[PDB]
């Protein structure tokens, strides 16, 4: 097979922003939660952006009679709503799937496994939703593997002292501001 309707897609190349450079005119309010999906978000069978369609877009072709009188028809995939169990998330995740995709999931032995397969083909035939799911699972796995220590209290201890010092000079100091200051330190 091929992933033509996926890998044809192109997204505007964001310029790498240096810390000292000037701002863009429209900077967003809330930050980027998820990683950027290489292949954007489908602009044709937008039905499939909400689910795990397995790179199965709608076809259009011809109904043909005994007289060979051609008439345009479309061929939809066998989509199905299906709440499937994630071991990593410890909850079942309900989404639209192609019956094919459900079969693949069953073969691979789980939904998390299906999401996390490292092949490029899989990545292509994950949606934007599928990509987000993968990210959620992978991040959770990483957390499970590696808890922070294998600092917050120190910051909390120092904060009031820092505030007092600021006041003695003359200025007031908030927590949030303190946190912002001492993130990289």
């Amino acid at each position: 097979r091929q992933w033509r309707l996926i890998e044809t897609r192109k997204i505007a190349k964001q310029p790498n922003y240096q810390v000292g450079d000037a701002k863009p005119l429209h900077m967003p309010k809330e930050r980027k939660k998820f990683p950027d999906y290489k292949y954007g978000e489908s602009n044709i069978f937008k039905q499939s952006n909400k689910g795990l369609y397995g790179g199965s877009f709608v076809q259009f072709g011809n109904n043909i009679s005994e007289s060979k009188a051609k008439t345009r028809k479309k061929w939809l995939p066998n989509v199905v709503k299906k709440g499937l169990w994630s071991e990593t998330l410890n909850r079942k995740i309900s989404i639209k799937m192609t019956a094919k995709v459900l079969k693949t999931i069953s073969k691979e032995g789980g939904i998390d496994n299906y999401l996390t397969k490292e092949k490029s083909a899989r990545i292509k035939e994950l949606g934007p939703t599928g990509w987000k799911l993968r990210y959620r699972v992978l991040k959770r796995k990483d957390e499970i593997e590696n808890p922070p220590h294998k600092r917050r209290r120190l910051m909390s201890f120092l904060y009031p002292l820092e505030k007092l010092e600021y006041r003695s000079v003359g200025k007031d100091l908030n927590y949030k501001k303190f946190v912002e200051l001492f993130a990289d330190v």
């Binding site: 939660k33 998820f34 990683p35 996390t116 490292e118 992978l138 796995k141």
Partner: protein, 49 residues
């Protein structure tokens, strides 16, 4: 935020690092000389015939 690397990807990276760590095959001056001499001999033989 950058997506984390899955297990297979990490293993591949480790393998690549190990490969890099080994001594790299590089074409020595001596090897080039040996080749060049052989080429010359071949040319001489061609000229003769």
């Amino acid at each position: 935020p950058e997506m984390p690397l899955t297990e297979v990807r990490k293993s591949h990276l480790a393998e690549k690092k190990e490969l890099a760590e080994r001594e790299v095959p590089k074409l020595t001056e001596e090897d080039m000389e040996a080749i060049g001499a052989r080429v010359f001999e071949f040319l001489e033989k061609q000229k003769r015939e």
